[PDB]
Amino acid sequence: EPSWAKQLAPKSGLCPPEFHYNREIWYPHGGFYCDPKGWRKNTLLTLGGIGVLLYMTFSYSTANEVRHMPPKGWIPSIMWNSNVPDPVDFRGRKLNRDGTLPEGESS
Amino acid sequence: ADRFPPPPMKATQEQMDAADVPYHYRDYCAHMYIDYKECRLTSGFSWRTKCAHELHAYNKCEYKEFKRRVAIAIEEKRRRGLIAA
Amino acid sequence: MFLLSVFFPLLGGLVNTSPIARFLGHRGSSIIAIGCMVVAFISSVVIYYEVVFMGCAVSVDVFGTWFSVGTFHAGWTFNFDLLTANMLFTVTGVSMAVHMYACDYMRQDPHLNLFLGYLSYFTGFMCVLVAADNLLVMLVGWEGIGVCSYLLIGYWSHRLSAVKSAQKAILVNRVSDGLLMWGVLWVWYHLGSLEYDLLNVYSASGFVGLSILIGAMGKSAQILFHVWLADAMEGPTPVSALIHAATLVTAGVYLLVRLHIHDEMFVIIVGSLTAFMAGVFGATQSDLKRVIAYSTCSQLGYMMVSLGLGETGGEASMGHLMTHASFKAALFLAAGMVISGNGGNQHIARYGGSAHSAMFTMLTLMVASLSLIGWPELSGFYSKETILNLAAICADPIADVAHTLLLLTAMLTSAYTTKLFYQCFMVDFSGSSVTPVRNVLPILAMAILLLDIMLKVWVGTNLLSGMLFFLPWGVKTLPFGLMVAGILTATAAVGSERFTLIRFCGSRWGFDQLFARSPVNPIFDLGRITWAIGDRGLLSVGNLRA
Amino acid sequence: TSLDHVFGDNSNKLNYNFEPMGMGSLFIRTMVMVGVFFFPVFIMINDDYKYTSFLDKVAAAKAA
Amino acid sequence: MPKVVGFQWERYEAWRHHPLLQFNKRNAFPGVGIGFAAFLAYVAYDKSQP
Amino acid sequence: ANAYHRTYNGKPVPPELQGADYITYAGVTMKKEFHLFDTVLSKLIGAGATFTCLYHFYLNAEEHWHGDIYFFEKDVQQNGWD
Amino acid sequence: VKPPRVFPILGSPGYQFFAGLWTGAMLTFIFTSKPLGRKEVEDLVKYDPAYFPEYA
Amino acid sequence: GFGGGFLDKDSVTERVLHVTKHFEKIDASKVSPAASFEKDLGLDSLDVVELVMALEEEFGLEIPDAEADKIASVGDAINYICSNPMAK
Amino acid sequence: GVFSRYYNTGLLCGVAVASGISIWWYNRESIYVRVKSDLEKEGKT
Amino acid sequence: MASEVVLALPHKLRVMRMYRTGLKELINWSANRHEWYPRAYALRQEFEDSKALTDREEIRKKLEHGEELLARFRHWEPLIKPEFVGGTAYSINPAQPKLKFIPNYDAMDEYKKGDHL
Amino acid sequence: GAGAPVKLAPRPDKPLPTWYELWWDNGYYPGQPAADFMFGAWPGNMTETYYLRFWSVFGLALAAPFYYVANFTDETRMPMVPQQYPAEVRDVLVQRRNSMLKHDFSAPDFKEVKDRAKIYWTPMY
Amino acid sequence: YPGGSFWSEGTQTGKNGFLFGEVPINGQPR
Ligand SMILES: CCCCCCCCCCCCCCCCCCCC(=O)O[C@H](COC(=O)CCCCCCCCCCCCCC)COP(=O)(O)OCCN
Ligand SMILES: CCCCCCCCCCCCCCCCCCCC(=O)O[C@H](COC(=O)CCCCCCCCCCCCCC)COP(=O)(O)OCCN
Ligand SMILES: CCCCCCCCCCCC(=O)SCCNC(=O)CCNC(=O)[C@H](O)C(C)(C)COP(=O)(O)O
């Protein structure tokens, strides 16, 4: 056996035992049946970083959304965005921010 | 189309702009279209039962226009001699 | 929520292909891919309810200007309007179930996370395509899904036929990409802008609609461009489901519906000829995936004719696209489960019985097949009958022949889909491998698409559902009789003795064989002339011996 | 040769001489290809001819 | 009138007609009875009497 | 593994594959097995699809027996025009 | 050729005759149903005294 | 499992002896390993063609035609199948 | 597939039957007249 | 007509290949295996009606006509088991051959790792 | 099942043809032509003459009905006129060459609208 | 799955290939 072969990872438990795949090659995506030992912790940390990216792009999207027409009723973006205009319904009547007809024609 | 003239429009331009009626739906049944769109887009899953009247009235108006279109075609072909009178 | 429908599948692809995936492995990458699709689907649901129902379009300046030289101005800008919300809901919802299926279907593949990253990239470039507000960011999406289609079709690269199928898809689509680019040049030159909202054309110079139609015929696999679509079955089953449902083949139809600058004669003739051709092609195949591929080509022909009919026809075309994606993806996933239950065999002569598949796979194939053949009050019934009735009242005399071609196509479709069910389950067993799949992830993947099939019946795509175009009972209920005729013929399993017609149709009219020598071999020979006779010959200057 | 009894041997050879196509076949197929893939050129040439013949008719019947 | 000549194929492959290898008609339409009963209950609840 | 066991050469069936749970026919033995998750999900989704079909057919039955023309013409003649 | 063992009615002569009967009828309805429908649509209004009292 | 991709000799022998006995003219007691198809068993060439096609069906193989021409006895078939890595 | 003469005979019988049905469809009353007579029939119940 | 390989065969093996290819083409043209069984019986009865012939001219005429029939009815989409040549599962994920490795190549003979001039 | 056996393709042991780059040898058996069906036997033993001969009838069998209806049938076959609009709505709708409202033979400017729907290709100057 | 479940430990420790073909000599920094 070569000197450097002791430094290499074994074939994982996902890989069939009769499959040969030249363990010295560094694949940028992981390679043949990649199964690292601390994978659950790494999965949790990458999920946390993805959540950070999710918050960042949610904030950027909310800051840069432009609505040239008022909506025709209540939309869920009213809850988190203050640039959403007041709804104007299908008959042209101005509405409240919770999507109900104002007093004078309600009930 | 003089023998079967069009009915008056009951929806103004401002009313069709307020309902955002598509420009190829702005015909002589546009008010019924406005009622049907307003009912259906706010009724969710159960639109077929609680907007049945608005859809039925819109289709009835389109039936009247369909009959007028058939009558216009019959009169035009009669004037051209294609159908004997 | 609006940018989360576009960025975030691209983020999932970036995670699963980078060296981050060296720390996650197969097990962690499957979790990352499924979560990164669930978030994008939730965002698309919010976008759909805001834009389709409450009518409030949203425009986002994302990354500033891309390039701006002279009056040619391309910006990194999105716009989320009715068509964009429709497409985003459809693409993300189908791609979520396909990811959930692929995390179990490709479990024994050695490079699973690479495959999942390619699927996510393909989905993200489709989202970029439909979210763009101008033509150049659309071209980013167009060529991005082309490249990812190449990477996914030729995934099993040690097989030469898969590599050649991927190269063929690239080259056939490159012809139409060239014509689409020249059409973009025409549009910008004679209207002054690239944004969709400033492209309102009443009367243009003919080359515009023709070249944009050719560019759309490439991606939507119409007549004389369909040749790459059947060979794209070399890729794995999730690739085929995502190609034939939500990505790639629906992009040209989306582009024509969005622009509405075509000339209707070409569109109607191309669409109806494509529908009849793919109907007779799929009636004479025995490969289980090739029949479904040809049914996809046939339905794209239906949508092409519909957008030829008019603005209402364009809406009906988008509606049939939206309802087609769900049952087509369901059909491919059920076929993949049947193939895996029968030891990898794809020939329908080696199936039979109810032992090689789960109960849910058979139910999925049955329900998606019933939606495809236009069984009454299912999802495909509404959209297909709308297109057929709109074609029966068009005042163009060309649409008279197109309607007849569509009715013949409807009978052929109900024939070969019933044949697909009959051979798979009803006949006696004629395989030798029974390994039925009953894992949770592919069953839930199929159940989601069946839920979307129910949703399309309960909540329509647009306002056309329930509108009555006034036709007699004879014209109206004829497609039901054509469906019944296809079912009765296919269950009777009858055949004709005209073997030369059978082998002309089963060999798919010889399009590939005729293309192998009408442009291809001449291109090779003209290259031989330009090199040997020109560079080494006529233009070569020799030495002076002394 | 350890798999020749499983997948077939190398005895059967490819029947192709690797020779160029015939001259007439190449010429005819190239002319068809030029007509199909360069149809805007013929469309625009026909437009120029139909336009200049109308101006010929105008200049003929105008000066009479 | 001889037809049993040359490798009896029906006897060799008579296991193809195993009852667990055939099409099962008991679960050919799963849930259709439940959906039909729910539809009948809805019709009696909503349209016939009220 | 494979879902059926084969016998060959008139051999006896192995004793683990006999009883009230197994079916042998012409030398091939298969197992009667009940799967719960598959059955429940298939029955639930199938009942949903059956109700979705039947309810919408019931809502449109009169427009499907007659056509559009007859149904709306009877509606005009019986229940007025405007 | 024998029918499948759980569906022997599909190989019956009556079933094959009925499938041929329905298929041929639908195939010729495809070609005949368009002008007959157009004549029905025209005759809806042509015989209406509210539109054309000359044709009764 | 067992074997480097190859089935064992005994189960292959049992399956080949099972396939071989499906003729009307065959006496079952004469069917043994290393028994000739024509001289010992009394099968013609068409019977041998059918037997090799049935063995293709039994072991899930696409036997090449030159190899199927060489099979002339029970032992030849057993030795061929035990040299297939694709024999299931 | 199955080469059936009953199916082939049924094809021509169906062509003939639907030709007769098309002839009956051509000589039918107007939908206005049919609806009016149907409503008159219902009004005597 | 047969190919140049089949025309080189002995007469017994030529007839055997003709019967074998006829059975396989009957598989390819049939809907199922249960459709195929009586067609296989009929093809066997067809070969049994020429077994007791002796005239080599009549044998040659029948052989050549049957080979023309088999060249006519060659199916455009043959049924191949997936893991064999022409199948759908052939040559997908083969085991890698042994590839050699060079450790620390950049560290061997540094300062002299370009191209000569 | 990864790791299935596959047969290797032999290396050339004879002089090569001049135009050898029309064979695709990827390392495994069998290789293929650079484009399929460019040489070698076609599937089903069909030939180019077969397809061209069947197409010389089948192409006119498909182009026949479109020509007949485009040259021997017109707008008056319909039992009704197109959808009617007010003048302010109609006047922009029929500006599209794409529109199906130009087939309204009861319109007072039917001819002029049809004369404006002629497709041009080179924009004139 | 190793361990009998999807949620078990991984089964690989050490270098999963050598980046740029660089192998550590005696544990020294590169
Ligand atoms: C080999 C091929 C690989 C393909 C890769 C995927 C396909 C990519 C296709 C498109 C690539 C475009 C990338 C552009 C990069 C930045 C360009 C803009 C530079 C800049 O300064 O702009 C500001 C940066 O903002 C921001 O960047 C936002 C601020 C930070 C909040 C969100 C963080 C990003 C989260 C993304 C998650 C993963 C997404 C993956 C694409 C935005 O402002 P402006 O000056 O333009 O002003 C106008 C609006 N205000
Ligand atoms: C519509 C028509 C349009 C026409 C457009 C034409 C465009 C021009 C095309 C060609 C332009 C480039 C010209 C030079 C090409 C040289 C090609 C390679 C020559 C070469 O390898 O050089 C030496 C051999 O040739 C030599 O010795 C070459 C000597 C230089 C060649 C030109 C000068 C010739 C003499 C000048 C007078 C000509 C007569 C004027 C009426 C090598 O030699 P070595 O060192 O290996 O061997 C020494 C032992 N002896
Ligand atoms: C799609 C369908 C296509 C049709 C395919 C062609 C069907 C035509 C079949 C009829 C044509 C013939 O019989 S071809 C002529 C075949 N007859 C002979 O050759 C004479 C007998 N001579 C012998 O040597 C042997 O008996 C021999 C039988 C060769 C070997 O059997 P054994 O070694 O045991 O002895």
Query: At a CB cut-off of 8 Å and minimum separation 6, what does C93 contact?
Result: C41, C44, C326, C448, C452
- Nearest C-alpha of chain G: how many angstroms from F60? 22
Q: In chain G, what residues touch E17 (CB-CB under 8 Å)?
A: 5
Compute CA distances D12 → C529, D4, D9, K37, whole Å: 32, 12, 8, 19
Shortest CA distance to C422 belongs to which of C373, C471, C477, C473? C373
Question: Which tokens sit at J18?
Answer: 């003709």
- Neighbour tally for C292: CB within 10 Å: 26
Helix intervals (H) in chain A? 39-64
Quickly list DSSP for C301-319: HHHHHHHHH-HHHHHHHHH
CA-to-CA distance for C99 and C119, rounded, in angstroms?
8
- Go through chain E and tell me how many residues it has: 50
CA-to-CA distance for B41 and B43, rounded, in angstroms?
6
Question: Which tokens sit at A20?
Answer: 């040969």
Shortest CA distance to C40 belongs to which of C81, C78, C96, C79? C96
CA-to-CA distance for B25 and K84, rounded, in angstroms?
10
For B46-84, b where at least 16 C-beta lie within 10 A, e where not — what string?
A: ebbeebeebbbebbbbbbbbbbbbbbbbbbbbbeeeebe
CA-to-CA distance for D27 and D21, rounded, in angstroms?
10
Q: Is C37 left (phi over 0), alpha (psi -120 to 50) or beta?
A: alpha
- Nearest C-alpha of chain J: how many angstroms from D51? 52
Strand bridging mode K32-33 / K23-24: antiparallel
Query: At a CB cut-off of 8 Å and minimum separation 6, what does G37 contact?
Result: C392, C471, C472, C474, C475
Whether residue C468 and residue F72 make contact (CB cut-off 8 A), yes or no, is yes
For J67-92, b where at least 16 C-beta lie within 10 A, e where not — what string?
A: beebeebbbbbebbbbbbbebbbbbb
CA-to-CA distance for F28 and K71, rounded, in angstroms?
68
Asked if K125 reaches chain D (Cβ–Cβ under 8 Å), the answer is no
Upstream peptide bond of K30 is cis (omega within 30 degrees of 0)? yes
Q: What percent of chain C is helix, strand and coil (3-state, nearest 5)?
A: 70, 5, 25
Query: At a CB cut-off of 8 Å and minimum separation 6, what does F31 contact?
Result: F3, F17, F21, F22, F23
- Of all ligands present, the nearest one to the C-alpha of J72 is 3
CA-to-CA distance for I19 and I31, rounded, in angstroms?
22
Question: Which tokens sit at A17?
Answer: 């035992």
CA-to-CA distance for G54 and L29, rounded, in angstroms?
107
- Nearest C-alpha of chain H: how many angstroms from E7? 5
Sign for the CA dihedral angle at C201, C207, C210, C215 comes to negative
Extended beta strands in chain G, E state: none
Sign for the CA dihedral angle at E15, E17, E23, E24 comes to negative
Compute CA distances C511 → C12, C514, D11, G39, K48, whole Å: 39, 5, 32, 42, 10
Shortest CA distance to B67 belongs to which of F77, C473, C464, K108? F77
Distance of CA C184 to the CA centre of its chain: 23
Compute CA distances H62 → C371, D6, F76, whole Å: 39, 8, 72
Compute CA distances C543 → C535, C539, J88, whole Å: 15, 13, 55
Quickly list DSSP for D2-47: TTHHHH--S-S------PPPPHHHHHHHHHHHHHHHTHHHHHHHHH
Query: At a CB cut-off of 8 Å and minimum separation 6, what does D49 contact?
Result: none
For G17-42, b where at least 16 C-beta lie within 10 A, e where not — what string?
A: bbbbbbbbbbbbbbebbbebbbbbbb
Q: In chain F, what residues touch C447 (CB-CB under 8 Å)?
A: 41, 45
Whether residue B26 and residue K89 make contact (CB cut-off 8 A), yes or no, is yes
CA-to-CA distance for C347 and J31, rounded, in angstroms?
10
Q: In chain I, what residues touch J31 (CB-CB under 8 Å)?
A: 1-2
SS (H, E, C) H21-40: CCCCCCCHHHCCCCCEHHHH
Question: Which tokens sit at C32?
Answer: 């990352």
Compute CA distances C74 → C59, C66, C81, C187, whole Å: 15, 6, 19, 14
**Are C360 and C446 in contact, with CB atoms under 8 Å apart?**
yes
**Are F55 and E36 in contact, with CB atoms under 8 Å apart?**
no
Experimental method: cryo-EM
CA Rg value for chain H: 12
Residues facing F28 on adjacent strands: F6, F25
User: Is residue A54 lining ligand 1, measured as CB closer than 6 Å?
Assistant: no
Sign for the CA dihedral angle at H44, H48, H49, H50 comes to positive
The DSSP element (H or E) to which I36 belongs, if any, is: helix I31-42
CA-to-CA distance for H34 and H13, rounded, in angstroms?
10
Residue with tokens 């190899």: H67
Instruction: Classify E13 as helix, strand or coil.
Output: coil
Strand bridging mode A65-66 / C58-69: antiparallel
Residues facing C494 on adjacent strands: I2
Angle (nearest 5°) at CA H7 between H6 and H13 = 135
Annotated catalytic residue H44: yes
Q: In chain G, what residues touch C427 (CB-CB under 8 Å)?
A: 4
Eight-class DSSP state of A36: B
CA-to-CA distance for F69 and F75, rounded, in angstroms?
10
Shortest CA distance to C93 belongs to which of C448, C446, C456? C448
Residue nearest to atom 45 of ligand 1 (CA): C64
The pairs formed by D11-15 with CB atoms below 8 angstroms and a separation of 24 or more are: D12/J5, D14/K23, D14/K40, D15/K40
Distance from residue C147's CA to the centre of ligand 1 (Å): 21
Phi/psi at L16 (5° precision): -95, 75
Residue nearest to atom 25 of ligand 2 (CA): C543
Asked if G2 reaches chain E (Cβ–Cβ under 8 Å), the answer is no
- Neighbour tally for K71: CB within 10 Å: 9
Phi/psi at A65 (5° precision): -85, 130
- Nearest C-alpha of chain D: how many angstroms from C35? 44
Q: Which amino acid is at C26?
A: H
Whether residue F56 and residue C438 make contact (CB cut-off 8 A), yes or no, is no
Residues facing A8 on adjacent strands: L15
Residue with tokens 């097989």: C159
Residues facing H73 on adjacent strands: H36
Query: At a CB cut-off of 8 Å and minimum separation 6, what does C531 contact?
Result: none
Shortest CA distance to C400 belongs to which of J59, F57, K77? K77
Whether residue B22 and residue C311 make contact (CB cut-off 8 A), yes or no, is yes
**Are K38 and K21 in contact, with CB atoms under 8 Å apart?**
no
**Are C340 and C438 in contact, with CB atoms under 8 Å apart?**
no
Compute CA distances B73 → B59, G43, G48, whole Å: 21, 12, 14
Residue with tokens 């960025």: C7
Asked if L29 reaches chain A (Cβ–Cβ under 8 Å), the answer is no
CA-to-CA distance for F27 and F50, rounded, in angstroms?
40
Residue nearest to atom 3 of ligand 1 (CA): C14
**Are C307 and C391 in contact, with CB atoms under 8 Å apart?**
no
Q: Which of H8, H10, H27, H44 is labelled catalytic?
A: H44
Strand bridging mode F22-25 / A65-66: unpaired
Distance of CA J85 to the CA centre of its chain: 8
CA-to-CA distance for C9 and A68, rounded, in angstroms?
28
- Neighbour tally for C461: CB within 10 Å: 22
Whether residue G6 and residue E22 make contact (CB cut-off 8 A), yes or no, is yes
Resolution (A): 2.8
Phi/psi at K119 (5° precision): -75, 130
Whether residue L12 and residue A34 make contact (CB cut-off 8 A), yes or no, is yes
**Are H51 and H43 in contact, with CB atoms under 8 Å apart?**
yes
CA-to-CA distance for K100 and K97, rounded, in angstroms?
8
Asked if F47 reaches chain E (Cβ–Cβ under 8 Å), the answer is yes
Instruction: Classify K33 as helix, strand or coil.
Output: strand
Question: Which tokens sit at C280?
Answer: 């007779």
Residue nearest to atom 16 of ligand 1 (CA): C63
First to last CA, chain I: 56
Which of H65, H71, H84 to probe the J interface (max J CBs under 10 A)?
H65
Which residue of J76, J85, J91 is in closest CB contact with K43? J76
Residue nearest to atom 18 of ligand 1 (CA): C63
Whether residue H85 and residue D9 make contact (CB cut-off 8 A), yes or no, is no
The DSSP element (H or E) to which C228 belongs, if any, is: helix C227-231
Strand bridging mode A65-66 / F5-6: unpaired
Instruction: Classify A53 as helix, strand or coil.
Output: helix
Helix intervals (H) in E1-50? 9-12, 32-43
CA-to-CA distance for H64 and H80, rounded, in angstroms?
12
Phi/psi at B76 (5° precision): -65, -45
For D11-36, b where at least 16 C-beta lie within 10 A, e where not — what string?
A: eeeeeeeeebeeeeebeebbeeeeee
**Are C169 and C275 in contact, with CB atoms under 8 Å apart?**
no
Instruction: Classify C80 as helix, strand or coil.
Output: strand
Asked if E46 reaches chain J (Cβ–Cβ under 8 Å), the answer is no
CA-to-CA distance for C393 and C468, rounded, in angstroms?
12
Q: Is C378 left (phi over 0), alpha (psi -120 to 50) or beta?
A: beta
Sign for the CA dihedral angle at C175, C176, C182, C185 comes to negative
CA-to-CA distance for A51 and A96, rounded, in angstroms?
33
CA-to-CA distance for I36 and J11, rounded, in angstroms?
84
User: Is residue C463 lining ligand 2, measured as CB closer than 6 Å?
Assistant: no
Distance from residue J47's CA to the centre of ligand 3 (Å): 5
Residues facing C75 on adjacent strands: C65
CA-to-CA distance for C1 and H31, rounded, in angstroms?
76
Q: Which amino acid is at D53?
A: S
Residues facing H36 on adjacent strands: H73
CA-to-CA distance for B80 and G53, rounded, in angstroms?
19
For A90, nearest residue in chain B (alpha carbons): B19
User: Is residue C69 lining ligand 2, measured as CB closer than 6 Å?
Assistant: no
- Nearest C-alpha of chain K: how many angstroms from C261? 7
Question: Which tokens sit at C190?
Answer: 């004679």
The DSSP element (H or E) to which C65 belongs, if any, is: strand C58-69
Whether residue C360 and residue F48 make contact (CB cut-off 8 A), yes or no, is no
